Design a protein around this ligand. Sequence first.
Ligand code: ZDC
Ligand code: ZDC
Ligand code: ZDC
Ligand code: OXE
Ligand code: OXE
Ligand code: OXE
Ligand code: CA
Ligand code: CA
Ligand code: CA
Ligand code: CA
Ligand code: CA
Ligand code: CA
Ligand code: CA
Ligand code: CA
Lengths: 114, 114, 114, 114, 11, 11, 11
Amino acid sequence: ATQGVFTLPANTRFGVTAFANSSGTQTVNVLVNNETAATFSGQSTNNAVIGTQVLNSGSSGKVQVQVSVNGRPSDLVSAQVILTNELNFALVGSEDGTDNDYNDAVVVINWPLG
Amino acid sequence: ATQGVFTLPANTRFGVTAFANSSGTQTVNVLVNNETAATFSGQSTNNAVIGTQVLNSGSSGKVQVQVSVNGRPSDLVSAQVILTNELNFALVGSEDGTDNDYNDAVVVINWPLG
Amino acid sequence: ATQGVFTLPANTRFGVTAFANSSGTQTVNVLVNNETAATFSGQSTNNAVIGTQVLNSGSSGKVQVQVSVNGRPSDLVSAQVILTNELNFALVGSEDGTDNDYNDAVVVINWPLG
Amino acid sequence: ATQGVFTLPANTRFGVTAFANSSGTQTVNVLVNNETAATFSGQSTNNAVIGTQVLNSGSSGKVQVQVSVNGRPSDLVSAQVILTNELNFALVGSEDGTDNDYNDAVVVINWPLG
Amino acid sequence: XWXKXKXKXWX
Amino acid sequence: XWXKXKXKXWX
Amino acid sequence: XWXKXKXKXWX
Ligand SMILES: *C(=O)C[C@@H]1O[C@@H](C)[C@@H](O)[C@@H](O)[C@@H]1O
Ligand SMILES: *C(=O)C[C@@H]1O[C@@H](C)[C@@H](O)[C@@H](O)[C@@H]1O
Ligand SMILES: *C(=O)C[C@@H]1O[C@@H](C)[C@@H](O)[C@@H](O)[C@@H]1O
Ligand SMILES: *Cc1ccccc1C*
Ligand SMILES: *Cc1ccccc1C*
Ligand SMILES: *Cc1ccccc1C*
Ligand SMILES: [Ca+2]
Ligand SMILES: [Ca+2]
Ligand SMILES: [Ca+2]
Ligand SMILES: [Ca+2]
Ligand SMILES: [Ca+2]
Ligand SMILES: [Ca+2]
Ligand SMILES: [Ca+2]
Ligand SMILES: [Ca+2]
């Protein structure tokens, strides 16, 4: 199944944050309406925050997270969770190798803000 | 029901990261085995990261998140989500006022690391 | 925080199913737009299904689950999870006593159907 | 990533329930420690319960859900969610066709029971 | 499922 | 409730 | 927080 694609409420500000846990440099692309809106790049085996940004979900609300290492797409896992019918998390893990820890890049999207 | 309390695997390193979306300064305490192990303090209405830290869940694995604003405890909401039976997120929202956006401090715990 | 309240897409059919795990007879009421739309009652300590039904979320989309035992409201916990940006679960647990297993009535709402 | 595999606490009773939303006849197989422990089959486009059963997770705790139609494995999506650090849901959706609703068989595993 | 109708897709 | 296990036998 | 300009109306 497709992973890393989320329909947010349209025209809504949201946060996106990436963490790295791999020997390889993680490239995290965040697409809004199928166009790149943010890119984070970094390497850590200690869960470092390699980037964080506030974006707008635009007219479609479509947000997609892609993760690659040196141009090679990682395998993604994802889900959205909503707490008290208000607070939204869209969550992505990714695997760049063979150990299947799925933490090589971890991406958290959250909304609403403010 | 109790919120903000999670049983992690014992003796395991985990990330904790907090974001702020409120006029008031957020204080985020993370307790491991009932003893304070991390405190973050900061203020933002635009999802700024107010802290990120790798901690050890210790012999009990018990991790508790508390949030307060100038001493007053915020109301918490939380859940744990596991993707592909490997990647764990413990998620906390918190409400310091009356509008029930539950984003005033947002806390993400993730494991495993590395 | 409020629990057991979910905003579904309007005018959408959804499933609601309740299971019991308690000595007490569970009464599960499902409200749509603030009016009772289904009521299940039953007793089991073995996860028996005490009711399942298809309902329409109506013009507002607002669905609320209430649980009581012998007329006393149980304490609720809840969250919504979305898989592959398509498949929705609204999940409720409830506690009628002191052991905090929160399984005394378990209610699963799922959509879309068909 | 692998989907439909969950590590439960060992030696623990759990409920498993399957719902159907497809023109195709669904067969859901539940494996405990790699051995078939329950099988449900049925056909509904109205979320009918095609099976519910109580099983024990055994010495390994490994539970796997498989879904097929006419002998062809459906594509699975899954996640586990824990509420108030106590109430667990292991959730599976499945797709037998091309519309990507992922509800063709929906499987809910819940624990603890009793 | 197979054929034409609601939800049928390629089947 | 009251009795055995997780609270069975009364009520 | 209190007053105007802190979310949506009161609170
Ligand atoms: C075959 O018809 C496809 C199948 O059944 C449809 C009624 C719909 O439920 C679709 O999601 C499913 O794959
Ligand atoms: C007493 O009735 C408590 C009640 O029933 C028990 C069998 C157990 O399920 C407990 O969780 C529940 O609150
Ligand atoms: C007042 O401090 C309330 C507080 O700050 C607002 C800007 C808004 O974020 C609100 O949700 C928060 O509780
Ligand atoms: C009805 C059906 C079952 C399995 C695979 C394909 C199709 C059309
Ligand atoms: C002990 C018990 C359990 C459930 C309902 C009533 C009573 C007295
Ligand atoms: C800002 C705040 C804090 C606590 C209670 C009420 C309000 C408006
Ligand atoms: Ca890896
Ligand atoms: Ca890794
Ligand atoms: Ca607030
Ligand atoms: Ca806020
Ligand atoms: Ca109970
Ligand atoms: Ca119980
Ligand atoms: Ca389908
Ligand atoms: Ca379907």
